[PDB]
Design a binder for this molecule. Structure first.
Ligand code: ATP
Ligand code: ATP
Ligand code: ADP
Ligand code: MG
Ligand code: MG
Ligand code: MG
Lengths: 468, 339, 489, 52, 468
């Protein structure tokens, strides 16, 4: 027969020997059997390399514990495929497309290979339509682009997932299109919580969830994103729907790629990352895009290892994004939520020709004041505001008020404080920050600007504290 | 203006989609048409004749690889010495020489330090000759002893080359007796057929390619299965058994290919593996032989490999050179060359 | 309406013209493959850096040539490559088509169009690794290449045939500077004089496709797409394309340079080229070095950038101006690739995020930015008004960091000069207007006006000089100097 | 500019609908023609004029 | 008897020879690239004997188009370059071929570029000053006639400008021969230097050897040896005083590293080759003045990433009599030449050679500048007003001294659009004695910027309104 046999097993990486003329093509899905009673299962290997002599190195989508050399490996003739259609909405799948909430559901659906080329360059059209969220900092300093690519950078425990939940609430609740969520190497209980939350808010019916979480082999963690992307691509192309693609967390995809590369015998790269880090990130990020007339608004949480923003993974991720929101531990320590670093976050559409003259001017003035305040940190941390000139002292007070006012009571923050969130229309934010940067609220106490919404909230809180 | 440009771009997108779809459909239909038409054997003959005409119009060219320069020179000297020595021997004597050479090669396989010492390059050979005589001056004939003396006198790049050389010499001896028998053509054809079948039965070759298993077991397996058959020449059977006996991690089928290569080479011809989807007429075989000899000058022997996937035409190959006249390759080029 | 006849004829051309010639060919076999790499046994006569054909129309380049096999980097698709596949020589080293037809097109590093606008009529072909002009084949850089930016044109002037590095952190305005430079050549192109015309070549390496599309849109709106060619190697491209794109652009520019034309080439950016080459070398299993880079990364960039030259008169007098871009992390110019490229180019414009946030736009860091051509790449009047300016701004920054009447006068003048150089994006300034602005600055005519109004005073005044007294500009634009009569007026 | 964008989107959608209809109704027209293309390609590859 | 190419990996080629015909180490071999576009004759320098008649060699020209198995010829000797008084006035490359006139020098005597350093008995310390006319160099970093001079610095701090200035100030009036070695530098700079030397009429007395930075590693390794061979011929045969300018010597070292791993060497610290110091020492010790025969070598040493702890410059430091260390801080402050007076040194800056007055003035200037460097942080944080009166006056004096060390160089006219200046050593000593004594405190510090002697200082003072 044409079946192959396991020759080497090194963790989640398996060498398979095949009769000549039957060596599977790259990315083909192979099937092997683990028969040990406790761990009995069917391994779905993925051909990663051709080693020669009719040997293929493959990545296991499942743990290989209990696998035996010489076991029979069969080639399906095609790569991993996942179900597609309007039926995938409202259900939970794993990296292989198996439904978890209803096992067996979706076999009869149409199936798409998780590997495909991105849109041709002729199809790509730059997107510049602003996506108003209702968050002052995001609306003002890094507006999101509808159909563009948004990223949420941040170290561990700075609010990436809470911000993703906030954006799901603000953008997905009243969304007329389809939503796709990809849990990539995140908390499993986070996936369960999101499932319950969507089922409660009644947005689940419009959403397809695909989960490969922490307790999975690296192959699953580096292919689950491709599966979710395949569903999103089907919705974008064969249905003309406006898709929403949430990914949490893409750095986990890169890290699983690093693990696999280490197991594949590839020479390491800087910081021990895989040599093909930029390439793989390139294919995955280029598939996630909006073509002419077909819109995907993608939002990705990017984990920053060891609070190091120069790490190769986020550093290479930075280039594929239309809007970037860099959460900072320094801001998070102050209690400012979202912990957005306004001097590092950026949006490609924060220019006068897109956001208008006054919006751009106010954002530029806010950034200038915050940059000046940052430049004085060395002096202030030793001597304080006492040695600064009157101009610098006034600017420091204004900057403290501005940086506090950029915080906001988020909707998703209620579960942590029992305080309902708020939404600020863009015009209100622009007017409020124009007033603040002009010194029209210097008399109010700083705490009046903390974790509030619009100008009415500011007035009420200042009144409560004791100011006007 | 932006809206107008977008409309134009979307029209171009639709145009490109239609081009891709129509091209794919047209190439698929053309492939179906060719596959349907080519089922006629007369069409096969016609395409073979056209390719042979092309070869006739082709411009003629005036243009042991693993062996290194020193190893190649040593092997050339050894084969010259064998030609000088074994020429006067008889069929029984040649068989004895081949058996003794195979036995000494197996002995060299058994022990490693002796092989390392014998094959170690050195300016002088007298110590090596004395070592060989003290080792096996009694268990081998005078001709075999002298051949081994010559083999060890020269130098080889690697230790294994030495034993390889001995193996090579052994094969020559058998081939020589075949020439004495006059059945060189029959043994060549039998070797090619055995190589073909071993290629067709990869599991059998793998079972024969595990040198760890005892040589006797594999040899007996091959004899009862493949080598020992009513319509098998005894010389070919002996050659194949000897080859599998000395199988040091090389595949059985590749070893048989090497045997056929050597058999044709000792006759002066060069083997040309011609892959065809149908058998060629005797006239076709003669024409192909003549044309291939003309381009390559030296006489060539054509070996037909039946392969229906070519859908007519031919795919000739000698050494590292291939003339890919197969229709399937042309179809693939047509599919891959479309806009 | 889509003309069925037109498309039928389009495919008729190929089907009628389809051909395939049997020919003796050296055989190779893919012995192993994976991750954009292959190993091919055979092809004894294969040359180093030779193109190779794998089934499906796939292409590769032979990097490692040893006795056992040939290591090859696959350009484009690689999951089609299989063990045992037949590999064909090409008898050709890497080369690309070249000609004027490439103007206004977007092509992949192989010269194949990707904008979906039809085939490109290639005048000829040019190898990617032809040697740069020798020491005796060049002449001193003497012609300015006006970027339209007051800061660059005054303090770090760029001449034709100069390599100026735009280095800085992400989102500091590097691509903005390069695109502004490309757009400022609109006037030169419209003059129709090949001595004045500058032909641009924008090379995108490892760049998001939508960003390349947006840059192309920006060039289209300003009319720069008439004389600009884009060599695109987006992030989805194989490491081979990312490695080869700068050389493709360099060869396309060299064709024009060796015919008397003046070429501007922008590499956006070389950091991603270096990363792609590192990936190729690591997959090929070559011994790594600093930051896991291959030992020849400096050689890569140096031989790429030395091809930008100003030819002598005997060779045609053409030129190619290089504008490589380098992305730094956390503003560390001490990394490997930034250090190499800084040591390669003829000066660097170092952009800083802090300066950008302060309102200094473009965020040129005067202290550490330089042009090694110097005043030779300026017209006379610009030299007169900027030669001191640059170093005086350096001194102003030093004194401002440090902190009598002289000191306060210096601080005031330096401040006014700083707000003089703040220029909005997509707001090019002709060389005569730049001369008049720097004249306002350095000659003391902005000391009376407050700092906060300097920019406004700079704009309105220029507009006034445009409406009335335009002849002033003419003088500068014609004699390339500020005459005494013109200066007094 | 908002009105211009709205009307641009409107004309874009109408043009897209008409272009989709055009492509759909021209695919059928060229379906009969593609037979000639296939036959001629087969003739070229085979080296003889295959009629089918 | 000829060889054959066996392996090719960039600039390293393995060649197999018949036994008894293996070339000696450093022998030159010839191979043919027959491809029309890149047709040429590769020169391969035998680097290692791998055994089995295999030799590893380094290609001097790019190996593009080379084919395995092509014939390799043994020249029987090392790379030999032409020597004599004919070479003066012509441009050569690392292989001795003439560029300004191809075929010129083929009939000259040829010297192997690999030579042993002079015997230790022939060496002799050099303790004679070489006045240049630059205030900083003359006062704090006196140069030595027949000694080894280096200009250290990072990228673009003024090494090449200072080299050109020294060519203008030393070579023009020089009565002997001059040898310039462009090692791994810009072709544009080489052409500019050639034109400038021709214009100054110094070319007839100068020999230029260029191996540029677009050349392969082998050329960048051997160009310095070729130029030094010409210099050694002039020193040993003609018995003539020689000026040897090398720019940039670090490239030599760098070139070695580029090929170290390919030759099969385990990398040392900071990625440098293990043989860094040994090869550097051989090359440098060949550059020296012997008893009765003088070479006044001047070298530009690139300091990677401004890091003076880098192994390359740190090793190079031991081979110099005088080192002018250019600094990035001084450069960024607008001070030219951007010399670090606290980091530069000279072996003849002692009372017994330069006299008590020169030594005293130099040491006082160094003391003042060191104290100012110490006080910089305090002045930045707590302002100058905090300092004592002694420290305040010392800071003002140090600022004036630090600016006065700057000077308007002739070679820099192309950048400042201004003519250069020359300051006699006596005038420099007088001016700096007065400055250290405080006799110019009443003058604005800006009056000390880019001037020559005291006359220029007075004229600039009256231009600035003050009086000397
Ligand atoms: N808006 C907010 N209001 C109050 N607390 C908040 C807010 N955002 C985040 N937090 C606190 O920060 C904790 C971490 O938030 P989150 O899980 O979103 O971070 P993360 O960056 O995704 O973390 P990790 O790296 O662990 O996945 C939350 O559990 C909550 O305690
Ligand atoms: N002189 C300027 N004035 C105002 N805005 C500017 C100026 N130059 C650039 N910008 C804006 O700054 C942002 C960053 O510009 P740009 O994309 O050129 O930077 P970059 O360094 O190339 O970025 P990236 O890291 O994304 O490649 C863009 O919004 C651009 O419009
Ligand atoms: N005396 C000077 N006056 C003004 N600028 C100078 C002076 N010396 C050096 N520079 C500046 O330093 C830059 C680098 O000079 P150069 O020596 O050519 O580079 P490197 O120091 O890297 O060799 C030049 O572009 C020039 O503008
Ligand atoms: Mg999280
Ligand atoms: Mg950019
Ligand atoms: Mg220099």
């Amino acid at each position: 027969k044409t079946a192959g046999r396991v020759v080497r097993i090194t963790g989640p990486v398996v060498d398979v020997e095949f009769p000549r003329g039957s060596v599977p093509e790259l990315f083909n899905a192979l099937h092997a059997e683990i028969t040990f009673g406790a761990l009995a299962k069917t391994l779905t290997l993925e051909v990663a390399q051709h080693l020669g002599d009719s040997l293929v190195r493959c990545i296991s989508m499942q743990p290989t514990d209990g696998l035996v050399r010489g076991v029979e490996v069969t080639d399906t003739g095609a790569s991993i495929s996942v179900p597609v259609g309007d039926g995938v909405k409202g259900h939970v799948f794993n990296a292989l497309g198996d439904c978890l909430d209803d096992p067996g559901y979706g076999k009869d659906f149409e199936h798409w290979s998780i590997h495909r080329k991105p849109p041709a360059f002729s199809d790509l059209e730059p997107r510049t339509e602003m996506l108003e969220t209702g968050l002052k900092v995001v609306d003002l300093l890094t507006p999101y682009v509808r159909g563009g690519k948004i990223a949420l950078f941040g170290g561990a425990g700075v609010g990436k997932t809470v911000l993703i939940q906030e954006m799901i609430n603000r953008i997905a609740r009243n969304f007329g299109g389809t939503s796709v969520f990809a849990g990539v190497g995140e908390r499993t209980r986070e996936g369960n919580d999101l499932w319950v939350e969507l089922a409660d808010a009644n947005v689940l019916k419009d959403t397809a969830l695909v989960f490969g979480q922490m307790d999975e082999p690296p192959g699953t963690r580096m292919r689950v994103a491709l599966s979710a992307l395949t569903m999103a691509e089907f919705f974008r192309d064969e249905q003309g729907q406006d898709v929403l693609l949430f990914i949490d967390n893409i750095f986990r995809f890169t890290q699983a790629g690093s693990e696999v590369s280490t197991l594949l015998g590839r020479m390491p790269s800087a910081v021990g990352y895989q040599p093909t880090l930029a390439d793989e990130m390139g294919e995955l990020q280029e598939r996630i895009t909006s073509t002419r007339g077909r819109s995907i608004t993608s939002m990705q949480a990017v984990y920053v290892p060891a609070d190091d923003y120069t790490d190769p993974a986020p550093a290479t991720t930075f280039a594929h994004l239309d809007a970037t929101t860099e959460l900072s531990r320094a801001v998070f320590s102050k209690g400012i939520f979202p912990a957005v670093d306004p001097l590092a976050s950026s949006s490609t559409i924060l220019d006068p020709a897109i956001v208008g003259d006054e919006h751009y001017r106010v954002a530029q003035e806010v950034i200038r004041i915050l940059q000046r305040y940052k430049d004085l940190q060395d002096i202030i941390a030793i001597l304080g505001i006492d040695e600064l000139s009157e101009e610098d002292k006034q600017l420091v007070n204004r900057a403290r008020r501005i940086e506090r006012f950029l915080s906001q009571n988020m909707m998703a923050a209620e579960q942590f404080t029992g305080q309902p969130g708020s939404t600020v229309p863009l015009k209100e934010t622009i007017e409020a920050f124009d007033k603040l940067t002009k010194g029209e609220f210097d008399h109010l106490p700083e705490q009046a600007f903390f974790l509030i919404g619009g100008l009415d909230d500011l007035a009420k809180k200042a009144e409560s504290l004791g100011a006007k | 203006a932006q809206g107008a440009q977008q409309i134009q771009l979307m029209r171009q997108q639709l145009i490109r989609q239609l081009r891709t779809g129509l091209g794919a459909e047209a190439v698929n239909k053309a492939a179906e048409i060719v596959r349907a038409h080519v089922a006629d054997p007369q069409a096969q003959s016609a395409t073979v004749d056209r390719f042979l005409s092309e070869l006739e119009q082709m411009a003629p060219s005036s243009v042991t690889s693993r062996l290194r320069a020193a190893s190649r020179q040593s092997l050339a000297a050894l084969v010259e010495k064998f030609d000088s020595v074994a020429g006067g021997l008889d069929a029984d004597g040649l068989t004895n020489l081949a058996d003794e050479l195979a036995s000494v090669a197996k002995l060299l396989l058994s022990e490693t330090a002796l092989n390392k010492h014998l094959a170690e390059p050195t300016d002088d050979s007298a110590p090596k000759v004395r070592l060989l005589e003290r080792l096996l001056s009694d268990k081998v004939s005078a001709t075999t002893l002298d051949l081994l003396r010559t083999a060890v006198s020269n130098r080889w790049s690697t230790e294994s080359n030495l034993i390889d050389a001995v193996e090579h010499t052994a094969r020559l001896a058998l081939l020589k007796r075949a020439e004495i028998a006059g059945e060189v053509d029959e043994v060549e054809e039998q070797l090619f057929r055995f190589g073909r079948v071993l290629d067709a039965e990869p599991r059998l070759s793998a079972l024969l390619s595990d040198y760890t298993t005892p040589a006797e077991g594999r040899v007996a397996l091959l004899d009862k299965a493949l080598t020992g058959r009513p319509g098998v020449n005894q010389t070919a059977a002996a050659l194949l058994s000897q080859t599998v006996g000395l199988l040091r991690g090389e595949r059985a089928d590749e070893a048989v290919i090497d045997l056929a290569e050597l058999a044709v080479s000792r006759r002066g011809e060069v083997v040309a593996h011609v892959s065809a989807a149908a058998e060629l007429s005797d006239a076709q075989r003669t024409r192909l032989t003549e044309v291939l000899s003309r381009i390559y000058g030296r006489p060539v022997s054509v070996q037909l490999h039946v392969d229906p996937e070519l859908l007519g035409g031919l795919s000739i190959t000698v050494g590292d050179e291939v003339i890919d006249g197969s229709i399937a390759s042309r179809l693939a080029a047509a599919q891959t060359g479309l806009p | 309406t889509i003309s069925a006849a037109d498309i039928e004829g389009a495919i008729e051309d190929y089907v009628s013209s389809f051909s395939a010639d049997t020919e003796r060919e050296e055989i190779g076999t893919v012995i192993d493959a994976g991750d954009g790499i292959a190993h091919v046994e055979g092809l004894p006569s294969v040359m180093t850096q030779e193109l190779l054909e794998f089934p499906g129309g796939v292409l590769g380049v032979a990097l490692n040539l040893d006795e056992h096999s040939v290591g090859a980097v696959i350009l484009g698709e690689f999951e089609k490559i299989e063990e045992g596949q037949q590999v064909k020589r090409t008898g050709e080293v890497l080369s690309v088509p070249v000609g004027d037809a490439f103007l206004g097109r977007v092509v992949n590093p192989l010269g194949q169009p990707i904008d979906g606008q039809g085939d490109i009529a290639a005048e000829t072909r040019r190898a990617l690794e032809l040697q740069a002009p020798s020491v005796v084949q060049r002449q001193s850089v003497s012609e300015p290449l006006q970027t339209g930016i007051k800061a660059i044109d005054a303090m770090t002037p760029i001449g034709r045939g100069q390599r100026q590095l735009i280095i800085g952190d992400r989102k500091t305005g590097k691509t903005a500077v390069c695109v502004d430079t490309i757009l400022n050549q609109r006037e030169a192109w419209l003059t129709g004089d090949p001595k004045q015309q500058v032909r641009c070549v924008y090379v995108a390496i490892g760049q998001k496709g939508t960003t390349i599309a947006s840059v192309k849109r920006a060039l289209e709106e300003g009319g720069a797409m008439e004389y600009t060619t884009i060599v695109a190697a987006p992030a989805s491209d194989a490491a081979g394309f990312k490695w080869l794109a700068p050389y493709t652009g360099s060869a396309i520019g060299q064709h024009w340079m060796y015919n008397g034309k003046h070429v501007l080439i922008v590499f956006d950016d070389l950091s991603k080229q270096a990363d792609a080459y590192r990936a190729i070398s690591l997959l090929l299993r070559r011994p790594p070095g600093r930051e896991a880079f291959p030992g020849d990364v400096f050689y890569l960039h140096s031989r790429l950038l030395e091809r930008c030259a100003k030819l002598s008169d005997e060779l045609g007098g053409g030129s190619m101006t290089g504008l490589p871009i380098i992305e730094t992390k956390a503003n560390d110019i001490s990394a490997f690739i930034p250090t190499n490229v800084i040591s390669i180019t003829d000066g660097q414009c170092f952009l800083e995020s802090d300066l950008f946030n302060q309102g200094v736009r473009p965020a040129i860091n005067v202290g550490v930015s330089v042009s090694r051509v110097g005043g030779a790449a300026q017209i006379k009047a610009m030299k007169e008004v900027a030669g001191s300016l640059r170093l005086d701004l350096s001194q102003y920054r030093e004194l401002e960091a440090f902190a009598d009447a002289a000191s306060k006068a210096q601080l005031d003048r330096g401040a006014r000069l700083v707000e003089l150089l703040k220029q909005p994006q997509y707001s090019p300034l002709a060389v005569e207007e730049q001369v008049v602005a720097i004249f306002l600055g350095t000659q003391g005519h902005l000391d009376s006006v407050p700092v906060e109004d300097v920019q406004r005073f700079e704009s309105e005044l220029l507009e006034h000089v445009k409406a009335s007294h335009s002849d002033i500009f003419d003088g500068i634009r014609e004699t390339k100097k500020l005459s005494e009569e013109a200066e007094e007026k | 500019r908002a009105q211009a964008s709205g009307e641009v989107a409107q004309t874009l959608t109408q043009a897209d609908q008409q272009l989709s209809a055009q492509g759909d109704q021209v695919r059928s027209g060229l379906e009969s023609s593609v037979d000639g293309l296939s036959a001629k390609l087969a003739s070229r590859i085979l080296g003889v004029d295959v009629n089918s």
